[PDB]
PDB file of C-alpha atoms and ligand atoms in Angstrom:
ATOM      1  CA  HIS P   1     -14.978 -16.283  -9.565  1.00 34.39           C
ATOM      2  CA  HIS P   2     -11.323 -15.189  -9.391  1.00 33.05           C
ATOM      3  CA  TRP P   3     -11.394 -12.201  -6.998  1.00 32.82           C
ATOM      4  CA  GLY P   4     -11.204  -8.721  -8.410  1.00 33.90           C
ATOM      5  CA  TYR P   5     -12.649  -5.310  -7.738  1.00 33.61           C
ATOM      6  CA  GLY P   6     -15.795  -5.711  -9.830  1.00 31.22           C
ATOM      7  CA  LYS P   7     -19.391  -5.941  -8.650  1.00 30.75           C
ATOM      8  CA  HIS P   8     -19.446  -9.733  -8.949  1.00 30.18           C
ATOM      9  CA  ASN P   9     -15.944 -10.564  -7.681  1.00 30.32           C
ATOM     10  CA  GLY P  10     -15.099  -7.550  -5.539  1.00 30.23           C
ATOM     11  CA  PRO P  11     -14.450  -6.994  -1.797  1.00 30.70           C
ATOM     12  CA  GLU P  12     -17.946  -8.036  -0.714  1.00 34.43           C
ATOM     13  CA  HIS P  13     -17.394 -11.473  -2.261  1.00 33.92           C
ATOM     14  CA  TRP P  14     -13.854 -12.193  -1.065  1.00 33.01           C
ATOM     15  CA  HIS P  15     -14.878 -13.901   2.191  1.00 33.51           C
ATOM     16  CA  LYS P  16     -16.300 -16.843   0.216  1.00 30.63           C
ATOM     17  CA  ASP P  17     -12.821 -17.799  -0.999  1.00 32.80           C
ATOM     18  CA  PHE P  18     -10.939 -16.266   1.937  1.00 30.13           C
ATOM     19  CA  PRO P  19     -12.877 -16.642   5.235  1.00 30.21           C
ATOM     20  CA  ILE P  20     -10.290 -14.507   7.022  1.00 32.09           C
ATOM     21  CA  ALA P  21     -11.853 -11.532   5.214  1.00 29.24           C
ATOM     22  CA  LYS P  22     -14.187 -11.474   8.224  1.00 31.22           C
ATOM     23  CA  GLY P  23     -11.334 -11.754  10.722  1.00 36.91           C
ATOM     24  CA  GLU P  24     -10.386  -9.832  13.881  1.00 35.90           C
ATOM     25  CA  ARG P  25      -7.687  -7.604  12.381  1.00 34.02           C
ATOM     26  CA  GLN P  26      -8.573  -6.843   8.787  1.00 31.90           C
ATOM     27  CA  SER P  27      -7.382  -3.731   6.946  1.00 31.22           C
ATOM     28  CA  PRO P  28      -7.931  -1.000   5.954  1.00 30.65           C
ATOM     29  CA  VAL P  29      -9.705   0.892   8.734  1.00 33.16           C
ATOM     30  CA  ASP P  30     -10.958   4.408   9.398  1.00 32.97           C
ATOM     31  CA  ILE P  31      -8.652   6.424  11.627  1.00 32.13           C
ATOM     32  CA  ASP P  32     -10.832   8.335  14.094  1.00 33.03           C
ATOM     33  CA  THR P  33      -8.827  11.335  15.355  1.00 33.81           C
ATOM     34  CA  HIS P  34     -11.147  11.631  18.346  1.00 33.44           C
ATOM     35  CA  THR P  35     -10.179   8.158  19.545  1.00 30.89           C
ATOM     36  CA  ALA P  36      -6.587   7.848  18.284  1.00 31.81           C
ATOM     37  CA  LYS P  37      -4.225   7.389  21.233  1.00 33.19           C
ATOM     38  CA  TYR P  38      -0.927   9.256  21.466  1.00 34.72           C
ATOM     39  CA  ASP P  39       1.738   6.814  22.676  1.00 34.39           C
ATOM     40  CA  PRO P  40       4.808   8.647  24.041  1.00 35.17           C
ATOM     41  CA  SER P  41       6.643   5.311  23.900  1.00 38.61           C
ATOM     42  CA  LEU P  42       6.589   5.060  20.100  1.00 39.22           C
ATOM     43  CA  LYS P  43      10.026   5.617  18.556  1.00 40.42           C
ATOM     44  CA  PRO P  44      10.603   7.678  15.405  1.00 37.62           C
ATOM     45  CA  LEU P  45      10.609   5.795  12.101  1.00 39.26           C
ATOM     46  CA  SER P  46      13.987   4.886  10.645  1.00 36.68           C
ATOM     47  CA  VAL P  47      13.980   4.749   6.847  1.00 33.64           C
ATOM     48  CA  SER P  48      17.169   3.863   4.964  1.00 32.51           C
ATOM     49  CA  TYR P  49      16.417   3.760   1.243  1.00 30.90           C
ATOM     50  CA  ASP P  50      19.705   5.214  -0.010  1.00 32.47           C
ATOM     51  CA  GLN P  51      20.752   1.739  -1.165  1.00 31.68           C
ATOM     52  CA  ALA P  52      17.358   0.825  -2.609  1.00 29.76           C
ATOM     53  CA  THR P  53      17.674  -1.040  -5.916  1.00 32.03           C
ATOM     54  CA  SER P  54      14.565  -0.963  -8.123  1.00 30.09           C
ATOM     55  CA  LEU P  55      14.298  -3.717 -10.743  1.00 27.59           C
ATOM     56  CA  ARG P  56      11.131  -3.426 -12.810  1.00 28.26           C
ATOM     57  CA  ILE P  57       7.550  -2.178 -12.909  1.00 28.79           C
ATOM     58  CA  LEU P  58       4.663  -4.480 -13.771  1.00 30.97           C
ATOM     59  CA  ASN P  59       0.902  -4.505 -14.300  1.00 28.85           C
ATOM     60  CA  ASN P  60      -0.387  -7.594 -12.486  1.00 30.34           C
ATOM     61  CA  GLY P  61      -4.094  -6.993 -13.057  1.00 33.29           C
ATOM     62  CA  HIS P  62      -4.754  -5.542  -9.601  1.00 32.67           C
ATOM     63  CA  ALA P  63      -2.478  -2.524  -9.773  1.00 34.45           C
ATOM     64  CA  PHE P  64       1.066  -1.817 -10.866  1.00 33.32           C
ATOM     65  CA  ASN P  65       4.062  -2.341  -8.651  1.00 34.33           C
ATOM     66  CA  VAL P  66       7.751  -1.618  -8.666  1.00 36.15           C
ATOM     67  CA  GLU P  67       9.853  -4.510  -7.432  1.00 38.03           C
ATOM     68  CA  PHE P  68      13.151  -4.125  -5.602  1.00 34.90           C
ATOM     69  CA  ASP P  69      16.189  -6.338  -5.077  1.00 37.29           C
ATOM     70  CA  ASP P  70      15.644  -7.441  -1.475  1.00 36.63           C
ATOM     71  CA  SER P  71      18.755  -9.623  -1.360  1.00 37.92           C
ATOM     72  CA  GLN P  72      21.163  -7.423   0.595  1.00 42.02           C
ATOM     73  CA  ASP P  73      20.290  -5.533   3.767  1.00 42.82           C
ATOM     74  CA  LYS P  74      20.019  -2.570   1.399  1.00 44.02           C
ATOM     75  CA  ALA P  75      16.810  -0.581   1.826  1.00 43.89           C
ATOM     76  CA  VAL P  76      15.322  -1.315   5.231  1.00 44.10           C
ATOM     77  CA  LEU P  77      12.672   0.036   7.567  1.00 43.99           C
ATOM     78  CA  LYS P  78      13.083  -0.034  11.331  1.00 42.59           C
ATOM     79  CA  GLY P  79      12.277   1.819  14.518  1.00 38.58           C
ATOM     80  CA  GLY P  80       8.753   2.989  15.204  1.00 40.47           C
ATOM     81  CA  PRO P  81       6.538   0.162  16.558  1.00 40.42           C
ATOM     82  CA  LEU P  82       8.834  -2.364  14.893  1.00 39.15           C
ATOM     83  CA  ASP P  83      11.247  -4.863  16.422  1.00 39.11           C
ATOM     84  CA  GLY P  84      14.099  -5.842  14.132  1.00 36.15           C
ATOM     85  CA  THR P  85      14.744  -5.031  10.485  1.00 33.34           C
ATOM     86  CA  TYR P  86      12.298  -5.098   7.563  1.00 34.40           C
ATOM     87  CA  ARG P  87      13.468  -5.264   3.923  1.00 32.44           C
ATOM     88  CA  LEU P  88      11.686  -3.239   1.230  1.00 31.47           C
ATOM     89  CA  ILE P  89      10.339  -5.571  -1.459  1.00 28.89           C
ATOM     90  CA  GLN P  90       7.929  -3.498  -3.589  1.00 31.84           C
ATOM     91  CA  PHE P  91       5.464  -0.633  -3.688  1.00 31.52           C
ATOM     92  CA  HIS P  92       2.150  -0.038  -5.450  1.00 29.59           C
ATOM     93  CA  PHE P  93      -0.848   2.303  -5.313  1.00 29.78           C
ATOM     94  CA  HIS P  94      -4.635   2.156  -4.985  1.00 30.78           C
ATOM     95  CA  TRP P  95      -6.717   4.876  -6.666  1.00 31.77           C
ATOM     96  CA  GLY P  96     -10.249   5.813  -7.673  1.00 31.80           C
ATOM     97  CA  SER P  97     -12.462   6.588 -10.653  1.00 34.04           C
ATOM     98  CA  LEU P  98     -12.407  10.234  -9.509  1.00 32.62           C
ATOM     99  CA  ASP P  99     -10.300  12.477  -7.250  1.00 35.63           C
ATOM    100  CA  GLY P 100     -12.848  12.215  -4.434  1.00 35.10           C
ATOM    101  CA  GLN P 101     -11.961   8.597  -3.632  1.00 36.59           C
ATOM    102  CA  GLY P 102      -9.212   6.037  -4.025  1.00 36.81           C
ATOM    103  CA  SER P 103      -7.459   5.590  -0.693  1.00 38.06           C
ATOM    104  CA  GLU P 104      -8.042   2.481   1.424  1.00 40.41           C
ATOM    105  CA  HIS P 105      -7.486   4.016   4.837  1.00 41.37           C
ATOM    106  CA  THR P 106      -9.579   7.083   5.664  1.00 41.00           C
ATOM    107  CA  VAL P 107      -9.103   9.793   8.282  1.00 39.83           C
ATOM    108  CA  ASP P 108     -12.293  10.798  10.072  1.00 43.09           C
ATOM    109  CA  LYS P 109     -14.121   9.224   7.124  1.00 43.55           C
ATOM    110  CA  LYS P 110     -12.240  11.424   4.648  1.00 43.51           C
ATOM    111  CA  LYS P 111     -11.052   9.672   1.485  1.00 44.54           C
ATOM    112  CA  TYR P 112      -7.914  10.686  -0.437  1.00 40.27           C
ATOM    113  CA  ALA P 113      -7.314  10.449  -4.199  1.00 43.74           C
ATOM    114  CA  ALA P 114      -4.921   7.521  -3.800  1.00 40.71           C
ATOM    115  CA  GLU P 115      -2.794   5.578  -1.348  1.00 40.98           C
ATOM    116  CA  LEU P 116       0.836   4.496  -1.717  1.00 40.75           C
ATOM    117  CA  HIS P 117       1.933   1.235  -0.066  1.00 40.71           C
ATOM    118  CA  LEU P 118       5.591   0.364   0.539  1.00 40.62           C
ATOM    119  CA  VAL P 119       5.790  -3.311   1.524  1.00 43.59           C
ATOM    120  CA  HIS P 120       8.570  -4.675   3.772  1.00 43.85           C
ATOM    121  CA  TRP P 121       9.173  -8.079   5.376  1.00 42.13           C
ATOM    122  CA  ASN P 122      10.717  -9.015   8.732  1.00 41.67           C
ATOM    123  CA  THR P 123      14.272 -10.284   8.145  1.00 38.09           C
ATOM    124  CA  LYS P 124      14.159 -12.572  11.188  1.00 38.93           C
ATOM    125  CA  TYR P 125      12.006 -14.982   9.161  1.00 39.45           C
ATOM    126  CA  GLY P 126      14.531 -15.585   6.389  1.00 36.60           C
ATOM    127  CA  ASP P 127      12.393 -14.832   3.350  1.00 37.06           C
ATOM    128  CA  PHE P 128       9.205 -13.072   2.313  1.00 35.80           C
ATOM    129  CA  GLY P 129       7.306 -16.341   1.992  1.00 35.87           C
ATOM    130  CA  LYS P 130       7.761 -17.340   5.629  1.00 33.30           C
ATOM    131  CA  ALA P 131       7.103 -13.851   6.976  1.00 34.43           C
ATOM    132  CA  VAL P 132       3.496 -13.734   5.734  1.00 35.52           C
ATOM    133  CA  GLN P 133       2.744 -16.691   8.006  1.00 37.80           C
ATOM    134  CA  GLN P 134       3.571 -14.649  11.121  1.00 33.50           C
ATOM    135  CA  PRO P 135       1.559 -11.887  12.856  1.00 36.83           C
ATOM    136  CA  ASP P 136       4.582  -9.555  12.716  1.00 34.93           C
ATOM    137  CA  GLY P 137       5.835 -10.720   9.335  1.00 34.51           C
ATOM    138  CA  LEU P 138       5.203  -7.599   7.275  1.00 33.67           C
ATOM    139  CA  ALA P 139       5.240  -3.847   7.692  1.00 37.00           C
ATOM    140  CA  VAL P 140       3.468  -1.644   5.178  1.00 35.39           C
ATOM    141  CA  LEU P 141       4.113   2.073   5.112  1.00 35.89           C
ATOM    142  CA  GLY P 142       1.006   3.864   3.893  1.00 37.98           C
ATOM    143  CA  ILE P 143       1.097   7.316   2.330  1.00 34.04           C
ATOM    144  CA  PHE P 144      -1.911   9.366   1.200  1.00 33.10           C
ATOM    145  CA  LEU P 145      -1.900  11.341  -2.044  1.00 32.58           C
ATOM    146  CA  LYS P 146      -3.903  14.577  -2.344  1.00 32.55           C
ATOM    147  CA  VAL P 147      -4.289  16.550  -5.588  1.00 33.71           C
ATOM    148  CA  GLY P 148      -2.311  19.783  -5.832  1.00 35.51           C
ATOM    149  CA  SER P 149       1.248  20.584  -6.865  1.00 35.10           C
ATOM    150  CA  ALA P 150       3.159  17.878  -8.725  1.00 34.16           C
ATOM    151  CA  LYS P 151       5.519  15.478  -6.958  1.00 36.38           C
ATOM    152  CA  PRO P 152       8.812  15.501  -8.914  1.00 34.56           C
ATOM    153  CA  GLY P 153       9.821  12.077  -7.626  1.00 33.90           C
ATOM    154  CA  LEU P 154       6.695  10.424  -9.013  1.00 32.85           C
ATOM    155  CA  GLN P 155       7.127  11.653 -12.587  1.00 31.37           C
ATOM    156  CA  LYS P 156       9.402   8.771 -13.608  1.00 35.08           C
ATOM    157  CA  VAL P 157       6.714   6.306 -12.516  1.00 34.91           C
ATOM    158  CA  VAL P 158       3.791   7.948 -14.318  1.00 36.02           C
ATOM    159  CA  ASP P 159       5.670   8.479 -17.593  1.00 38.51           C
ATOM    160  CA  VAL P 160       6.377   4.762 -17.956  1.00 35.95           C
ATOM    161  CA  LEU P 161       2.785   3.640 -17.408  1.00 33.98           C
ATOM    162  CA  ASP P 162       2.145   3.891 -21.152  1.00 32.85           C
ATOM    163  CA  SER P 163       4.251   0.792 -21.777  1.00 31.62           C
ATOM    164  CA  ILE P 164       2.511  -1.415 -19.183  1.00 29.43           C
ATOM    165  CA  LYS P 165      -1.159  -0.577 -19.819  1.00 31.07           C
ATOM    166  CA  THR P 166      -2.322  -4.203 -19.846  1.00 34.33           C
ATOM    167  CA  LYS P 167      -2.052  -7.129 -17.420  1.00 34.40           C
ATOM    168  CA  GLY P 168       1.176  -9.051 -17.932  1.00 31.89           C
ATOM    169  CA  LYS P 169       3.208  -6.134 -19.268  1.00 31.49           C
ATOM    170  CA  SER P 170       6.547  -5.540 -17.535  1.00 30.88           C
ATOM    171  CA  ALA P 171       9.407  -3.093 -18.061  1.00 29.48           C
ATOM    172  CA  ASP P 172      12.882  -2.702 -16.578  1.00 26.39           C
ATOM    173  CA  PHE P 173      12.709   0.039 -13.968  1.00 27.50           C
ATOM    174  CA  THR P 174      16.199   0.543 -12.586  1.00 29.90           C
ATOM    175  CA  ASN P 175      17.610   3.495 -10.657  1.00 26.35           C
ATOM    176  CA  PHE P 176      14.346   4.656  -9.105  1.00 25.77           C
ATOM    177  CA  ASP P 177      14.811   6.260  -5.684  1.00 25.07           C
ATOM    178  CA  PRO P 178      11.742   5.778  -3.441  1.00 26.68           C
ATOM    179  CA  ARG P 179      12.887   8.634  -1.183  1.00 26.59           C
ATOM    180  CA  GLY P 180      11.308  11.068  -3.632  1.00 24.94           C
ATOM    181  CA  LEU P 181       7.874   9.717  -2.683  1.00 26.94           C
ATOM    182  CA  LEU P 182       8.118  10.460   1.021  1.00 28.03           C
ATOM    183  CA  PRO P 183       6.488  13.439   2.717  1.00 25.35           C
ATOM    184  CA  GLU P 184       8.373  15.963   4.838  1.00 26.46           C
ATOM    185  CA  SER P 185       7.187  14.634   8.205  1.00 29.53           C
ATOM    186  CA  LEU P 186       7.378  11.045   9.398  1.00 33.38           C
ATOM    187  CA  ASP P 187       4.701  11.370  12.103  1.00 35.05           C
ATOM    188  CA  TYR P 188       2.451   8.318  11.958  1.00 34.79           C
ATOM    189  CA  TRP P 189      -0.469   6.236  13.195  1.00 33.43           C
ATOM    190  CA  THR P 190       0.005   2.508  13.709  1.00 33.51           C
ATOM    191  CA  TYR P 191      -2.150  -0.570  14.301  1.00 32.29           C
ATOM    192  CA  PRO P 192      -2.021  -4.338  13.677  1.00 30.22           C
ATOM    193  CA  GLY P 193      -3.777  -5.355  10.483  1.00 30.71           C
ATOM    194  CA  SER P 194      -3.775  -7.399   7.296  1.00 27.14           C
ATOM    195  CA  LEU P 195      -3.077  -7.389   3.583  1.00 28.25           C
ATOM    196  CA  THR P 196      -5.899  -5.544   1.780  1.00 27.80           C
ATOM    197  CA  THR P 197      -6.186  -7.969  -1.130  1.00 29.24           C
ATOM    198  CA  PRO P 198      -6.479 -11.765  -1.045  1.00 33.34           C
ATOM    199  CA  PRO P 199      -5.122 -13.825   0.692  1.00 36.93           C
ATOM    200  CA  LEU P 200      -5.821 -11.114   3.302  1.00 37.66           C
ATOM    201  CA  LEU P 201      -3.357 -12.611   5.800  1.00 37.93           C
ATOM    202  CA  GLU P 202      -3.280 -10.840   9.182  1.00 38.36           C
ATOM    203  CA  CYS P 203       0.503 -10.441   9.203  1.00 40.80           C
ATOM    204  CA  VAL P 204       0.903  -6.680   8.863  1.00 42.84           C
ATOM    205  CA  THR P 205       1.953  -3.933  11.221  1.00 40.19           C
ATOM    206  CA  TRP P 206       0.453  -0.847   9.599  1.00 36.86           C
ATOM    207  CA  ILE P 207       2.284   2.467   9.619  1.00 36.87           C
ATOM    208  CA  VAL P 208       0.235   5.257   8.086  1.00 38.09           C
ATOM    209  CA  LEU P 209       1.847   8.667   7.741  1.00 37.66           C
ATOM    210  CA  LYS P 210      -0.131  11.711   8.866  1.00 40.79           C
ATOM    211  CA  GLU P 211       1.255  13.951   6.109  1.00 40.06           C
ATOM    212  CA  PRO P 212      -0.053  13.240   2.592  1.00 41.39           C
ATOM    213  CA  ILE P 213       2.105  13.883  -0.469  1.00 40.07           C
ATOM    214  CA  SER P 214       0.811  16.243  -3.126  1.00 38.94           C
ATOM    215  CA  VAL P 215       0.506  15.074  -6.721  1.00 42.80           C
ATOM    216  CA  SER P 216      -0.943  16.978  -9.672  1.00 44.90           C
ATOM    217  CA  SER P 217      -4.261  16.133 -11.331  1.00 45.25           C
ATOM    218  CA  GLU P 218      -2.213  15.425 -14.449  1.00 43.40           C
ATOM    219  CA  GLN P 219      -0.166  12.794 -12.609  1.00 41.67           C
ATOM    220  CA  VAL P 220      -3.067  10.919 -10.987  1.00 39.94           C
ATOM    221  CA  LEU P 221      -4.924  10.956 -14.290  1.00 38.54           C
ATOM    222  CA  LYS P 222      -2.315   8.662 -15.865  1.00 35.13           C
ATOM    223  CA  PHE P 223      -3.053   5.991 -13.239  1.00 35.22           C
ATOM    224  CA  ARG P 224      -6.584   5.799 -14.638  1.00 38.32           C
ATOM    225  CA  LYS P 225      -5.453   4.785 -18.130  1.00 35.46           C
ATOM    226  CA  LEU P 226      -4.250   1.350 -17.021  1.00 39.12           C
ATOM    227  CA  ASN P 227      -6.436  -1.720 -17.611  1.00 39.17           C
ATOM    228  CA  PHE P 228      -7.334  -4.756 -15.489  1.00 43.52           C
ATOM    229  CA  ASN P 229      -7.552  -7.003 -18.555  1.00 41.40           C
ATOM    230  CA  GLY P 230      -4.698  -8.492 -20.549  1.00 42.98           C
ATOM    231  CA  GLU P 231      -3.806  -7.446 -24.089  1.00 46.83           C
ATOM    232  CA  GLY P 232      -6.427  -8.597 -26.570  1.00 44.81           C
ATOM    233  CA  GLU P 233      -9.449  -8.844 -24.274  1.00 45.46           C
ATOM    234  CA  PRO P 234     -12.539  -6.877 -23.162  1.00 44.68           C
ATOM    235  CA  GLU P 235     -11.316  -3.473 -21.980  1.00 47.62           C
ATOM    236  CA  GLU P 236     -11.858  -2.899 -18.262  1.00 46.92           C
ATOM    237  CA  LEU P 237     -10.234   0.248 -16.886  1.00 50.16           C
ATOM    238  CA  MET P 238      -8.137  -0.135 -13.744  1.00 47.45           C
ATOM    239  CA  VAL P 239      -9.950   2.236 -11.378  1.00 46.92           C
ATOM    240  CA  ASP P 240     -11.286   1.918  -7.826  1.00 48.07           C
ATOM    241  CA  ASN P 241      -8.922  -0.891  -6.879  1.00 47.28           C
ATOM    242  CA  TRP P 242      -9.406  -0.184  -3.172  1.00 42.41           C
ATOM    243  CA  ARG P 243     -10.992  -2.146  -0.335  1.00 41.61           C
ATOM    244  CA  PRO P 244     -13.532  -0.363   1.909  1.00 42.93           C
ATOM    245  CA  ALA P 245     -12.755   0.226   5.595  1.00 46.48           C
ATOM    246  CA  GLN P 246     -13.164  -2.833   7.815  1.00 43.58           C
ATOM    247  CA  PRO P 247     -14.434  -3.175  11.424  1.00 45.52           C
ATOM    248  CA  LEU P 248     -11.847  -2.015  13.953  1.00 47.06           C
ATOM    249  CA  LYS P 249     -13.001  -4.639  16.467  1.00 46.80           C
ATOM    250  CA  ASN P 250     -10.990  -4.517  19.709  1.00 44.87           C
ATOM    251  CA  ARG P 251      -8.016  -2.721  18.165  1.00 45.71           C
ATOM    252  CA  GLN P 252      -6.572   0.620  19.238  1.00 41.03           C
ATOM    253  CA  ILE P 253      -4.915   3.017  16.818  1.00 41.12           C
ATOM    254  CA  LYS P 254      -1.862   4.732  18.255  1.00 39.27           C
ATOM    255  CA  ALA P 255      -0.296   8.016  17.183  1.00 36.72           C
ATOM    256  CA  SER P 256       3.387   8.965  17.378  1.00 36.79           C
ATOM    257  CA  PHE P 257       2.383  12.610  17.686  1.00 35.31           C
ATOM    258  CA  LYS P 258       0.417  14.691  20.177  1.00 35.43           C
TER     259      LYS P 258
HETATM  260  N1  667 L 301      -2.601  -3.422   0.242  1.00 33.86           N
HETATM  261  S1  667 L 301      -1.381  -4.551   0.380  1.00 33.86           S
HETATM  262  O1  667 L 301       0.134  -3.956   0.426  1.00 33.86           O
HETATM  263  O2  667 L 301      -1.668  -5.643   1.567  1.00 33.86           O
HETATM  264  O3  667 L 301      -1.430  -5.303  -0.766  1.00 33.86           O
HETATM  265  C1  667 L 301      -0.895  -6.541  -1.002  1.00 33.86           C
HETATM  266  C2  667 L 301      -1.708  -7.665  -0.899  1.00 33.86           C
HETATM  267  C3  667 L 301      -1.162  -8.970  -1.149  1.00 33.86           C
HETATM  268  C4  667 L 301       0.242  -9.118  -1.511  1.00 33.86           C
HETATM  269  C5  667 L 301       0.875 -10.533  -1.794  1.00 33.86           C
HETATM  270  C6  667 L 301       2.226 -10.627  -2.127  1.00 33.86           C
HETATM  271  C7  667 L 301       3.083  -9.330  -2.211  1.00 33.86           C
HETATM  272  O4  667 L 301       4.264  -9.413  -2.501  1.00 33.86           O
HETATM  273  O5  667 L 301       2.485  -7.805  -1.935  1.00 33.86           O
HETATM  274  C8  667 L 301       1.086  -7.920  -1.606  1.00 33.86           C
HETATM  275  C9  667 L 301       0.516  -6.628  -1.357  1.00 33.86           C
HETATM  276  C10 667 L 301       2.956 -12.007  -2.424  1.00 33.86           C
HETATM  277  C11 667 L 301       2.509 -13.264  -1.586  1.00 33.86           C
HETATM  278  C12 667 L 301       1.773 -12.958  -0.249  1.00 33.86           C
HETATM  279  C13 667 L 301       0.265 -12.653  -0.446  1.00 33.86           C
HETATM  280  C14 667 L 301      -0.023 -11.811  -1.701  1.00 33.86           C
HETATM  281 ZN1   ZN L 302     -13.242  14.616  20.192  1.00 32.37          ZN
HETATM  282 ZN1   ZN L 303      -1.815  -1.974  -1.127  1.00 33.02          ZN
END
């Protein structure tokens, strides 16, 4: 039926509605450190979020995301394996039913408690809608979350989750600075991939940071209180909203660090 993350509408069923699910560059993938290739040509990432303008946070039934005003050339991502400028549009997370799983990408088969995705679109295509139709239309910055000390910058996000527990619930979320979610180092791995939820378009240049951010058990726990269902319906806890690793095929994962 409508795709989801359940046993009867989850990732293993998506290909029926979206044939590309079995494509040549699907995401996520497992990053093998034995085969990752250091590319001395890769430029450092350039992140300019000082002018980022958050608008609201919403539960869309697949996860929760914070939307940004992508009108002006405000918050942009450039450099790295990218050509041109990419505007930040929104960010969301993927997490598990327990600390031992939740991330989409894995490193040497290791799974993290959650994964943060900052989505950006290539300005040369005019708008977000037209970018998804191109192989270099989007750039998603992926950040792993491990359980440990608390991340101050994430507190504002977790404290507001109470008010958007069910699908359809939205809340104004202004003045949130995404810089507080970034790790110390910007070293990264990169490869061409796709969106990890339907429509699964292969229009993403993936940039996965090597350094995970630390979040407390208390913080991650609040993610698990959200629901997939809308208000006034069978309760189905929003947990394990991640897609398993997909076949690497003929792709090569490059590293910006030795
Ligand atoms: N893991 S992820 O960043 O690829 O997740 C997604 C998957 C699909 C979308 C889509 C849209 C978006 O804004 O963020 C997305 C993030 C809107 C329309 C394009 C396809 C669906
Ligand atoms: Zn080796
Ligand atoms: Zn995602």
